[PDB]
Amino acid sequence: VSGTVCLSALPPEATDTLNLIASDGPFPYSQDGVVFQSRESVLPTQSYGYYHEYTVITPGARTRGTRRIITGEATQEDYYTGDHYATFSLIDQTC
């Protein structure tokens, strides 16, 4: 994991995605909520089903883009990637 980032430093759309995760949706895309298979990633190794992925919208794009939040099972364990799962930072919702 790349480091920790304060939510206030991320695009505003990442706040919108965390607020949909807190309400259980409804989500804009059917790929929001699917299990993320962390097998090739830099996230900590976990068994199938521990991580799930959600879209952070990129304003103006004609596709889902490359920004996502991955959740883990622990309290406030959420990671942001802006480059389609190449690098991740742990989000700190308190700053």
Side-chain angles (χ1 to χ4, degrees), residues 1-38 41-95:
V1 166
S2 259
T4 294
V5 54
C6 286
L7 185 57
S8 68
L10 293 178
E13 289 75 31
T15 294
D16 289 341
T17 298
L18 290 170
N19 279 345
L20 292 178
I21 293 164
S23 62
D24 249 279
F27 297 102
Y29 291 109
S30 60
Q31 291 280 294
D32 287 344
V34 298
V35 174
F36 176 71
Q37 291 200 40
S38 43
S41 72
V42 307
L43 288 177
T45 297
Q46 304 281 2
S47 207
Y48 203 80
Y50 188 91
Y51 286 119
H52 291 89
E53 60 164 295
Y54 300 84
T55 308
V56 172
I57 283 183
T58 296
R62 71 165 287 285
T63 65
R64 281 189 4 260
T66 58
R67 300 176 186 170
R68 310 275 187 267
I69 281 172
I70 289 7
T71 60
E73 272 185 15
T75 294
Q76 296 189 51
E77 182 188 0
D78 296 282
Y79 299 94
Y80 177 75
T81 170
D83 56 7
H84 208 263
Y85 314 108
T87 56
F88 289 92
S89 296
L90 178 68
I91 299 175
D92 184 344
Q93 290 180 239
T94 75
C95 63

Coordinates of all heavy atoms in Angstrom, one line a residue, unseen atoms left out:
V1 N 0.8 -1.2 0.0 CA 0.0 0.0 0.0 C 0.9 1.2 0.0 O 2.0 1.3 0.6 CB -1.1 -0.1 1.1 CG1 -1.7 1.2 1.4 CG2 -2.1 -1.1 0.6
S2 N 0.5 2.3 -0.8 CA 1.3 3.4 -1.1 C 1.6 4.4 0.1 O 2.6 5.1 0.0 CB 0.7 4.3 -2.2 OG 1.4 4.0 -3.4
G3 N 0.7 4.3 1.1 CA 0.7 5.3 2.1 C -0.9 5.5 2.5 O -1.6 4.7 2.1
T4 N -1.0 6.5 3.3 CA -2.4 6.8 3.8 C -2.7 8.2 3.2 O -1.9 9.1 3.1 CB -2.3 6.9 5.3 OG1 -2.1 5.6 5.8 CG2 -3.7 7.4 5.9
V5 N -4.0 8.4 2.8 CA -4.4 9.7 2.3 C -5.6 10.2 3.0 O -6.5 9.4 3.3 CB -4.7 9.6 0.7 CG1 -5.7 8.5 0.4 CG2 -5.0 11.0 0.1
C6 N -5.6 11.4 3.3 CA -6.8 12.0 3.9 C -7.9 12.1 2.9 O -7.7 12.4 1.7 CB -6.5 13.5 4.3 SG -5.4 13.6 5.8
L7 N -9.2 11.7 3.3 CA -10.3 11.9 2.4 C -10.3 13.3 1.8 O -10.8 13.3 0.6 CB -11.6 11.6 3.2 CG -12.9 11.6 2.4 CD1 -12.9 10.5 1.2 CD2 -14.0 11.3 3.3
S8 N -10.1 14.3 2.6 CA -10.2 15.6 2.0 C -9.2 15.9 0.8 O -9.5 16.9 0.1 CB -10.0 16.7 3.1 OG -8.6 16.6 3.6
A9 N -8.2 15.0 0.6 CA -7.3 15.3 -0.5 C -7.8 14.6 -1.7 O -7.1 14.7 -2.8 CB -5.9 14.8 -0.1
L10 N -8.7 13.6 -1.6 CA -9.1 12.9 -2.8 C -10.2 13.6 -3.6 O -10.7 14.7 -3.1 CB -9.8 11.6 -2.3 CG -8.7 10.7 -1.6 CD1 -9.5 9.4 -1.1 CD2 -7.6 10.2 -2.6
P11 N -10.5 13.3 -4.8 CA -11.5 13.9 -5.6 C -12.8 13.9 -4.8 O -13.1 12.9 -4.1 CB -11.6 13.1 -6.9 CG -10.3 12.4 -6.9 CD -9.8 12.2 -5.6
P12 N -13.7 14.9 -4.9 CA -15.0 14.8 -4.2 C -15.8 13.6 -4.4 O -16.6 13.2 -3.6 CB -15.8 16.0 -4.8 CG -14.8 16.7 -5.6 CD -13.5 16.0 -5.9
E13 N -15.6 13.0 -5.7 CA -16.4 11.8 -6.0 C -16.1 10.6 -5.1 O -16.9 9.8 -5.0 CB -16.1 11.4 -7.5 CG -16.7 12.4 -8.5 CD -15.9 13.7 -8.6 OE1 -14.7 13.8 -8.4 OE2 -16.6 14.7 -8.9
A14 N -14.9 10.7 -4.6 CA -14.6 9.6 -3.6 C -15.4 9.7 -2.4 O -15.8 8.7 -1.8 CB -13.1 9.7 -3.2
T15 N -15.7 10.9 -1.9 CA -16.7 11.1 -0.8 C -18.0 10.6 -1.1 O -18.7 9.9 -0.4 CB -16.7 12.6 -0.3 OG1 -15.4 12.9 0.2 CG2 -17.7 12.8 0.7
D16 N -18.5 10.8 -2.4 CA -19.8 10.3 -2.8 C -19.8 8.8 -2.8 O -20.8 8.2 -2.3 CB -20.0 10.7 -4.3 CG -20.3 12.2 -4.6 OD1 -20.6 12.9 -3.6 OD2 -20.0 12.7 -5.7
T17 N -18.7 8.2 -3.2 CA -18.7 6.7 -3.2 C -18.7 6.1 -1.8 O -19.5 5.2 -1.5 CB -17.5 6.2 -4.0 OG1 -17.6 6.6 -5.3 CG2 -17.4 4.7 -4.0
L18 N -17.9 6.7 -0.9 CA -18.0 6.3 0.5 C -19.5 6.4 1.1 O -19.8 5.6 1.9 CB -17.0 6.9 1.4 CG -15.5 6.5 1.2 CD1 -14.6 7.5 2.0 CD2 -15.4 5.1 1.6
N19 N -20.1 7.5 0.7 CA -21.4 7.7 1.3 C -22.4 6.7 0.7 O -23.3 6.2 1.5 CB -21.9 9.2 0.9 CG -21.3 10.2 1.8 OD1 -20.8 10.0 2.9 ND2 -21.3 11.5 1.3
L20 N -22.3 6.2 -0.6 CA -23.1 5.1 -1.1 C -22.8 3.8 -0.4 O -23.6 3.0 -0.2 CB -23.0 5.1 -2.6 CG -23.5 6.2 -3.5 CD1 -23.1 6.0 -4.9 CD2 -25.0 6.4 -3.3
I21 N -21.5 3.6 -0.1 CA -21.1 2.4 0.6 C -21.8 2.4 2.0 O -22.3 1.3 2.4 CB -19.6 2.2 0.7 CG1 -19.0 2.0 -0.7 CG2 -19.3 1.0 1.6 CD1 -17.5 2.2 -0.7
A22 N -21.8 3.5 2.6 CA -22.4 3.6 4.0 C -23.9 3.3 3.9 O -24.5 2.8 4.9 CB -22.2 5.0 4.5
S23 N -24.5 3.7 2.8 CA -26.0 3.4 2.8 C -26.3 2.1 2.1 O -27.5 1.9 1.9 CB -26.7 4.6 2.1 OG -26.3 4.7 0.8
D24 N -25.4 1.3 1.7 CA -25.7 0.2 0.8 C -26.3 0.6 -0.5 O -27.2 -0.1 -0.9 CB -26.5 -0.9 1.6 CG -25.5 -2.0 1.7 OD1 -25.3 -2.7 0.7 OD2 -24.8 -2.0 2.8
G25 N -25.9 1.7 -1.1 CA -26.4 2.0 -2.4 C -27.7 2.8 -2.3 O -27.9 3.4 -1.3
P26 N -28.4 2.8 -3.4 CA -28.2 2.1 -4.6 C -27.0 2.6 -5.4 O -26.6 3.7 -5.2 CB -29.5 2.2 -5.4 CG -30.1 3.5 -4.9 CD -29.7 3.6 -3.4
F27 N -26.3 1.7 -6.1 CA -25.1 2.0 -6.8 C -25.3 2.3 -8.3 O -26.3 1.6 -8.8 CB -24.1 0.9 -6.7 CG -23.7 0.6 -5.2 CD1 -24.2 -0.4 -4.5 CD2 -22.8 1.5 -4.7 CE1 -23.9 -0.6 -3.2 CE2 -22.5 1.4 -3.3 CZ -23.0 0.3 -2.6
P28 N -24.5 3.1 -8.9 CA -24.8 3.4 -10.3 C -24.4 2.3 -11.3 O -24.9 2.3 -12.5 CB -23.9 4.6 -10.6 CG -22.9 4.6 -9.5 CD -23.6 4.0 -8.3
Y29 N -23.5 1.4 -11.0 CA -23.0 0.4 -11.9 C -23.1 -1.0 -11.3 O -23.0 -1.2 -10.1 CB -21.5 0.6 -12.1 CG -21.3 1.9 -12.9 CD1 -20.8 3.0 -12.3 CD2 -21.7 1.9 -14.2 CE1 -20.7 4.2 -13.1 CE2 -21.6 3.1 -15.0 CZ -21.1 4.2 -14.4 OH -20.9 5.4 -15.1
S30 N -23.4 -2.0 -12.2 CA -23.6 -3.3 -11.6 C -22.3 -3.9 -11.1 O -22.3 -4.9 -10.4 CB -24.4 -4.2 -12.7 OG -23.6 -4.3 -13.8
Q31 N -21.2 -3.4 -11.6 CA -19.9 -3.8 -11.0 C -19.6 -3.2 -9.6 O -18.6 -3.6 -9.0 CB -18.7 -3.5 -11.9 CG -18.7 -4.4 -13.2 CD -18.1 -5.7 -12.7 OE1 -16.9 -5.7 -12.4 NE2 -18.9 -6.8 -12.8
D32 N -20.5 -2.3 -9.1 CA -20.2 -1.8 -7.7 C -20.6 -2.9 -6.7 O -21.8 -3.4 -6.7 CB -21.0 -0.6 -7.5 CG -20.5 0.6 -8.3 OD1 -19.4 0.5 -8.8 OD2 -21.3 1.5 -8.5
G33 N -19.7 -3.3 -5.9 CA -19.9 -4.2 -4.8 C -19.4 -5.6 -5.1 O -19.7 -6.5 -4.3
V34 N -18.9 -5.8 -6.3 CA -18.4 -7.2 -6.7 C -17.2 -7.5 -5.8 O -16.5 -6.6 -5.4 CB -18.2 -7.4 -8.2 CG1 -19.6 -7.1 -8.9 CG2 -17.1 -6.5 -8.7
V35 N -16.9 -8.8 -5.6 CA -15.7 -9.1 -5.0 C -14.5 -8.8 -5.8 O -14.5 -8.9 -7.1 CB -15.7 -10.7 -4.7 CG1 -14.3 -11.1 -4.2 CG2 -16.8 -11.0 -3.8
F36 N -13.5 -8.1 -5.1 CA -12.2 -7.9 -5.8 C -11.2 -9.0 -5.5 O -10.9 -9.2 -4.3 CB -11.6 -6.5 -5.3 CG -10.3 -6.1 -5.8 CD1 -10.2 -5.7 -7.2 CD2 -9.2 -6.2 -5.0 CE1 -9.0 -5.4 -7.7 CE2 -8.0 -5.8 -5.6 CZ -7.9 -5.4 -6.9
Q37 N -10.7 -9.5 -6.6 CA -9.7 -10.6 -6.3 C -8.4 -10.0 -6.2 O -7.9 -9.5 -7.2 CB -9.8 -11.6 -7.5 CG -11.1 -12.4 -7.5 CD -11.1 -13.7 -8.3 OE1 -10.1 -14.5 -8.2 NE2 -12.2 -14.0 -8.9
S38 N -7.8 -10.1 -5.0 CA -6.6 -9.3 -4.6 C -5.3 -10.1 -5.0 O -4.2 -9.6 -4.7 CB -6.7 -9.0 -3.1 OG -7.1 -10.2 -2.4
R39 N -5.5 -11.2 -5.6 CA -4.4 -12.1 -5.9 C -3.2 -11.5 -6.6 O -2.1 -11.8 -6.2 CB -4.9 -13.3 -6.9 CG -4.4 -14.6 -6.4
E40 N -3.3 -10.6 -7.6 CA -2.1 -10.0 -8.2 C -1.8 -8.7 -7.6 O -0.8 -8.0 -8.1 CB -2.3 -9.9 -9.7 CG -3.5 -10.7 -10.3
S41 N -2.6 -8.2 -6.7 CA -2.4 -6.8 -6.3 C -1.4 -6.7 -5.1 O -1.0 -7.6 -4.5 CB -3.8 -6.2 -5.8 OG -4.1 -6.9 -4.6
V42 N -1.2 -5.5 -4.7 CA -0.3 -5.1 -3.6 C -1.1 -5.0 -2.3 O -0.6 -4.7 -1.3 CB 0.4 -3.8 -3.9 CG1 1.1 -3.9 -5.3 CG2 -0.6 -2.6 -4.0
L43 N -2.4 -5.4 -2.3 CA -3.1 -5.3 -1.0 C -2.7 -6.5 -0.2 O -2.3 -7.5 -0.8 CB -4.6 -5.4 -1.3 CG -5.2 -4.2 -2.0 CD1 -6.7 -4.5 -2.3 CD2 -5.1 -3.0 -1.1
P44 N -2.9 -6.5 1.1 CA -2.5 -7.5 2.0 C -3.3 -8.8 1.6 O -4.5 -8.7 1.1 CB -3.0 -7.0 3.4 CG -2.9 -5.5 3.2 CD -3.4 -5.2 1.8
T45 N -2.6 -9.9 1.6 CA -3.3 -11.2 1.2 C -4.4 -11.6 2.1 O -4.4 -11.5 3.4 CB -2.3 -12.4 1.2 OG1 -1.3 -12.1 0.3 CG2 -3.0 -13.7 0.7
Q46 N -5.5 -11.9 1.4 CA -6.8 -12.3 2.1 C -7.5 -13.3 1.2 O -7.3 -13.3 0.0 CB -7.7 -11.1 2.4 CG -7.1 -10.0 3.3 CD -7.0 -10.4 4.7 OE1 -7.3 -11.4 5.3 NE2 -6.5 -9.4 5.6
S47 N -8.3 -14.1 1.9 CA -9.1 -15.1 1.1 C -10.2 -14.5 0.3 O -10.7 -13.4 0.7 CB -9.7 -16.0 2.2 OG -9.9 -17.3 1.8
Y48 N -10.7 -15.2 -0.7 CA -11.8 -14.7 -1.5 C -13.0 -14.1 -0.7 O -13.5 -14.8 0.2 CB -12.4 -15.9 -2.4 CG -13.0 -15.3 -3.6 CD1 -12.5 -14.8 -4.8 CD2 -14.4 -15.3 -3.4 CE1 -13.4 -14.3 -5.7 CE2 -15.3 -14.8 -4.4 CZ -14.8 -14.3 -5.5 OH -15.6 -13.8 -6.4
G49 N -13.4 -12.9 -1.1 CA -14.6 -12.3 -0.6 C -14.3 -11.2 0.4 O -15.2 -10.5 0.9
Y50 N -13.1 -11.1 0.9 CA -12.7 -10.1 1.9 C -12.8 -8.6 1.3 O -13.1 -7.8 2.1 CB -11.2 -10.3 2.3 CG -10.8 -9.5 3.5 CD1 -10.9 -9.9 4.8 CD2 -10.2 -8.2 3.2 CE1 -10.4 -9.2 5.9 CE2 -9.8 -7.4 4.3 CZ -9.9 -7.9 5.6 OH -9.5 -7.1 6.6
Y51 N -12.4 -8.6 0.0 CA -12.4 -7.1 -0.5 C -13.5 -7.1 -1.5 O -13.9 -8.0 -2.3 CB -11.1 -7.0 -1.4 CG -9.8 -7.0 -0.5 CD1 -8.9 -8.0 -0.7 CD2 -9.6 -5.9 0.3 CE1 -7.7 -7.9 0.1 CE2 -8.4 -5.9 1.1 CZ -7.5 -6.9 0.9 OH -6.3 -6.9 1.6
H52 N -14.1 -5.8 -1.6 CA -15.1 -5.5 -2.7 C -14.7 -4.2 -3.3 O -14.1 -3.4 -2.7 CB -16.5 -5.4 -2.0 CG -17.0 -6.7 -1.5 ND1 -16.7 -7.0 -0.2 CD2 -17.8 -7.7 -2.0 CE1 -17.2 -8.3 0.0 NE2 -17.9 -8.7 -1.1
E53 N -15.2 -4.0 -4.6 CA -14.7 -2.8 -5.3 C -16.0 -2.0 -5.7 O -17.1 -2.5 -6.0 CB -14.0 -3.2 -6.6 CG -14.7 -4.1 -7.6 CD -13.9 -4.0 -8.9 OE1 -13.9 -2.9 -9.4 OE2 -13.4 -5.1 -9.3
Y54 N -15.7 -0.7 -5.7 CA -16.8 0.3 -6.1 C -16.2 1.4 -6.9 O -15.1 1.8 -6.8 CB -17.3 1.0 -4.8 CG -17.8 0.0 -3.8 CD1 -17.0 -0.7 -2.9 CD2 -19.3 -0.3 -3.8 CE1 -17.6 -1.7 -2.1 CE2 -19.7 -1.3 -3.0 CZ -18.9 -2.0 -2.1 OH -19.5 -2.9 -1.2
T55 N -17.0 1.9 -7.9 CA -16.6 2.9 -8.8 C -16.6 4.3 -8.1 O -17.5 4.7 -7.3 CB -17.6 3.1 -9.9 OG1 -17.9 1.8 -10.5 CG2 -17.0 4.0 -11.0
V56 N -15.5 5.0 -8.3 CA -15.5 6.5 -8.0 C -15.6 7.1 -9.4 O -14.7 7.0 -10.2 CB -14.1 6.8 -7.5 CG1 -13.9 8.4 -7.3 CG2 -14.0 6.2 -6.1
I57 N -16.7 7.8 -9.6 CA -16.9 8.4 -11.0 C -15.8 9.4 -11.4 O -15.4 10.2 -10.5 CB -18.3 9.0 -10.9 CG1 -19.3 7.8 -11.0 CG2 -18.6 10.0 -12.1 CD1 -20.7 8.2 -11.0
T58 N -15.4 9.4 -12.6 CA -14.6 10.5 -13.2 C -15.5 11.4 -14.0 O -16.1 10.9 -15.0 CB -13.5 9.8 -14.1 OG1 -12.6 9.0 -13.3 CG2 -12.7 10.9 -14.8
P59 N -15.7 12.6 -13.6 CA -16.6 13.5 -14.2 C -16.2 13.7 -15.7 O -15.1 13.7 -16.1 CB -16.4 14.9 -13.5 CG -16.1 14.3 -12.1 CD -15.0 13.3 -12.5
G60 N -17.3 13.5 -16.5 CA -17.0 13.7 -18.0 C -16.6 12.5 -18.7 O -16.6 12.6 -19.9
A61 N -16.2 11.4 -18.0 CA -15.7 10.3 -18.8 C -16.8 9.5 -19.5 O -17.9 9.5 -19.0 CB -14.9 9.3 -17.9
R62 N -16.4 8.9 -20.7 CA -17.5 8.1 -21.3 C -17.6 6.7 -20.8 O -18.5 5.9 -21.2 CB -17.2 8.1 -22.8 CG -16.1 7.4 -23.4 CD -16.2 7.2 -25.0 NE -17.3 6.2 -25.1 CZ -17.3 4.9 -24.9 NH1 -16.5 4.0 -24.6 NH2 -18.6 4.4 -25.1
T63 N -16.6 6.3 -19.9 CA -16.6 4.9 -19.3 C -16.6 5.1 -17.8 O -16.6 6.2 -17.2 CB -15.3 4.2 -19.7 OG1 -14.2 4.9 -19.0 CG2 -15.0 4.3 -21.2
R64 N -16.5 4.0 -17.1 CA -16.3 4.0 -15.7 C -15.0 4.5 -15.3 O -14.8 4.7 -14.1 CB -16.4 2.5 -15.1 CG -17.9 2.2 -15.0 CD -18.2 1.0 -14.3 NE -17.3 0.2 -13.6 CZ -16.5 -0.7 -13.1 NH1 -15.7 -1.6 -13.5 NH2 -16.5 -0.4 -11.8
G65 N -14.0 4.7 -16.2 CA -12.7 5.3 -15.8 C -11.8 4.4 -15.0 O -12.0 3.2 -14.9
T66 N -10.9 5.0 -14.2 CA -9.9 4.2 -13.6 C -9.9 4.4 -12.1 O -8.9 3.8 -11.5 CB -8.4 4.6 -14.1 OG1 -8.2 5.9 -13.8 CG2 -8.4 4.2 -15.6
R67 N -10.8 5.1 -11.5 CA -10.8 5.4 -10.0 C -11.8 4.5 -9.3 O -12.9 4.2 -9.8 CB -11.3 6.9 -9.8 CG -10.3 7.8 -10.5 CD -10.8 9.3 -10.4 NE -9.8 10.1 -11.3 CZ -10.1 11.4 -11.5 NH1 -11.1 12.1 -11.1 NH2 -9.2 11.9 -12.4
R68 N -11.3 3.9 -8.2 CA -12.1 2.9 -7.5 C -11.8 3.0 -6.0 O -10.7 3.5 -5.6 CB -11.8 1.4 -7.8 CG -11.7 1.2 -9.4 CD -13.2 0.9 -9.8 NE -13.1 0.5 -11.3 CZ -13.3 1.4 -12.3 NH1 -13.4 2.7 -12.1 NH2 -13.2 0.9 -13.5
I69 N -12.7 2.6 -5.1 CA -12.5 2.3 -3.8 C -12.6 0.8 -3.5 O -13.6 0.2 -4.0 CB -13.5 3.1 -2.9 CG1 -12.9 4.5 -2.9 CG2 -13.5 2.5 -1.4 CD1 -13.8 5.5 -2.2
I70 N -11.7 0.2 -2.8 CA -11.8 -1.2 -2.4 C -12.0 -1.2 -0.9 O -11.2 -0.6 -0.2 CB -10.5 -1.9 -2.8 CG1 -10.2 -2.1 -4.3 CG2 -10.5 -3.3 -2.2 CD1 -11.0 -1.5 -5.4
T71 N -13.1 -1.9 -0.5 CA -13.2 -2.0 0.9 C -12.7 -3.4 1.5 O -12.7 -4.3 0.7 CB -14.7 -2.1 1.3 OG1 -15.4 -3.2 0.7 CG2 -15.4 -0.8 0.8
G72 N -12.2 -3.3 2.7 CA -11.8 -4.6 3.4 C -12.9 -4.8 4.5 O -13.7 -3.9 4.8
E73 N -12.7 -5.9 5.2 CA -13.8 -6.2 6.2 C -13.6 -5.4 7.5 O -14.5 -5.3 8.3 CB -13.6 -7.7 6.5 CG -14.4 -8.5 5.5 CD -14.5 -10.0 5.7 OE1 -14.1 -10.4 6.8 OE2 -14.9 -10.7 4.7
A74 N -12.4 -4.9 7.8 CA -12.1 -4.2 9.1 C -12.8 -2.9 9.1 O -13.0 -2.2 8.1 CB -10.7 -4.2 9.4
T75 N -13.0 -2.3 10.3 CA -13.6 -1.0 10.5 C -12.7 0.1 9.8 O -11.5 0.2 10.0 CB -13.6 -0.7 12.0 OG1 -14.6 -1.7 12.4 CG2 -14.1 0.7 12.3
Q76 N -13.3 0.8 8.9 CA -12.7 1.9 8.2 C -11.5 1.4 7.4 O -10.6 2.2 7.0 CB -12.2 3.1 9.0 CG -13.6 3.6 9.5 CD -13.5 5.0 10.2 OE1 -13.0 5.9 9.6 NE2 -14.1 5.0 11.4
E77 N -11.5 0.2 6.9 CA -10.4 -0.3 6.1 C -10.9 -0.1 4.6 O -11.7 -0.9 4.1 CB -10.1 -1.8 6.3 CG -8.9 -2.3 5.5 CD -8.8 -3.9 5.5 OE1 -9.6 -4.5 6.2 OE2 -7.8 -4.3 4.8
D78 N -10.4 1.0 4.0 CA -10.9 1.3 2.6 C -9.7 1.8 1.9 O -9.0 2.7 2.5 CB -11.9 2.5 2.8 CG -13.2 2.0 3.5 OD1 -14.1 1.3 3.0 OD2 -13.2 2.4 4.7
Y79 N -9.6 1.5 0.6 CA -8.4 1.9 -0.1 C -8.8 2.6 -1.4 O -9.8 2.2 -2.0 CB -7.6 0.6 -0.6 CG -7.2 -0.3 0.6 CD1 -8.0 -1.3 1.0 CD2 -6.0 -0.1 1.2 CE1 -7.6 -2.1 2.1 CE2 -5.6 -0.9 2.3 CZ -6.4 -1.9 2.7 OH -6.0 -2.7 3.8
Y80 N -8.0 3.6 -1.8 CA -8.4 4.3 -3.1 C -7.3 4.0 -4.1 O -6.1 3.9 -3.7 CB -8.2 5.8 -2.7 CG -8.4 6.7 -4.0 CD1 -9.7 6.8 -4.5 CD2 -7.4 7.2 -4.7 CE1 -10.0 7.6 -5.6 CE2 -7.6 8.0 -5.8 CZ -8.9 8.2 -6.3 OH -9.1 8.9 -7.4
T81 N -7.8 3.7 -5.3 CA -6.8 3.6 -6.4 C -7.3 4.6 -7.5 O -8.5 4.7 -7.8 CB -6.6 2.2 -6.9 OG1 -5.8 2.3 -8.2 CG2 -8.0 1.6 -7.3
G82 N -6.4 5.4 -8.1 CA -6.7 6.3 -9.2 C -6.2 5.7 -10.5 O -6.4 6.5 -11.5
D83 N -5.5 4.6 -10.5 CA -4.8 4.2 -11.7 C -5.2 2.7 -12.0 O -4.3 1.9 -12.4 CB -3.3 4.4 -11.5 CG -2.8 3.7 -10.3 OD1 -3.5 2.9 -9.6 OD2 -1.6 4.0 -9.9
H84 N -6.5 2.4 -11.8 CA -6.9 1.1 -12.2 C -6.2 -0.1 -11.5 O -5.7 -1.0 -12.2 CB -6.8 1.0 -13.7 CG -7.9 0.1 -14.3 ND1 -7.6 -1.2 -14.6 CD2 -9.2 0.3 -14.6 CE1 -8.7 -1.7 -15.1 NE2 -9.7 -0.8 -15.1
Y85 N -6.0 0.0 -10.2 CA -5.5 -1.0 -9.4 C -4.0 -1.2 -9.4 O -3.5 -2.1 -8.7 CB -6.3 -2.4 -9.7 CG -7.8 -2.3 -9.9 CD1 -8.2 -2.5 -11.3 CD2 -8.7 -2.1 -9.0 CE1 -9.6 -2.4 -11.6 CE2 -10.1 -2.1 -9.2 CZ -10.5 -2.2 -10.5 OH -11.9 -2.2 -10.9
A86 N -3.3 -0.3 -10.0 CA -1.8 -0.4 -10.0 C -1.3 0.0 -8.6 O -0.4 -0.6 -8.2 CB -1.3 0.4 -11.1
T87 N -1.8 1.2 -8.1 CA -1.4 1.5 -6.8 C -2.5 1.9 -5.8 O -3.6 2.1 -6.4 CB -0.5 2.8 -6.8 OG1 -1.2 3.9 -7.3 CG2 0.8 2.5 -7.6
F88 N -2.3 1.7 -4.5 CA -3.5 1.9 -3.6 C -3.0 2.8 -2.4 O -1.8 2.7 -2.0 CB -3.9 0.6 -3.0 CG -4.6 -0.3 -4.0 CD1 -3.9 -1.2 -4.7 CD2 -6.0 -0.2 -4.1 CE1 -4.5 -2.1 -5.6 CE2 -6.6 -1.1 -5.0 CZ -5.9 -2.0 -5.7
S89 N -3.9 3.6 -1.8 CA -3.5 4.3 -0.6 C -4.7 3.9 0.4 O -5.8 3.9 0.0 CB -3.5 5.8 -0.8 OG -2.5 6.2 -1.7
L90 N -4.4 3.8 1.7 CA -5.5 3.6 2.7 C -6.1 5.0 2.9 O -5.4 6.0 3.1 CB -4.8 3.2 4.0 CG -5.7 3.0 5.1 CD1 -6.7 1.9 5.0 CD2 -4.8 2.6 6.3
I91 N -7.4 5.0 2.9 CA -8.1 6.3 3.2 C -8.3 6.6 4.7 O -8.8 5.7 5.4 CB -9.5 6.2 2.5 CG1 -9.3 5.9 1.1 CG2 -10.3 7.5 2.8 CD1 -10.7 5.6 0.4
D92 N -8.0 7.8 5.0 CA -8.2 8.2 6.4 C -9.4 9.2 6.4 O -9.3 10.3 5.9 CB -6.9 9.0 6.9 CG -7.0 9.3 8.4 OD1 -8.2 9.3 8.9 OD2 -5.9 9.6 8.9
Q93 N -10.5 8.6 6.9 CA -11.8 9.4 6.9 C -11.8 10.5 8.0 O -12.8 11.3 8.1 CB -13.0 8.5 7.1 CG -13.2 7.7 5.8 CD -14.4 6.7 5.9 OE1 -14.1 5.5 5.8 NE2 -15.5 7.3 6.1
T94 N -10.7 10.6 8.8 CA -10.8 11.6 9.9 C -10.0 12.9 9.5 O -10.1 13.8 10.3 CB -10.1 11.1 11.1 OG1 -8.6 11.1 10.9 CG2 -10.5 9.7 11.5
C95 N -9.5 13.0 8.3 CA -8.8 14.3 7.9 C -9.0 14.6 6.4 O -9.8 13.9 5.7 CB -7.3 14.2 8.2 SG -6.5 12.8 7.3

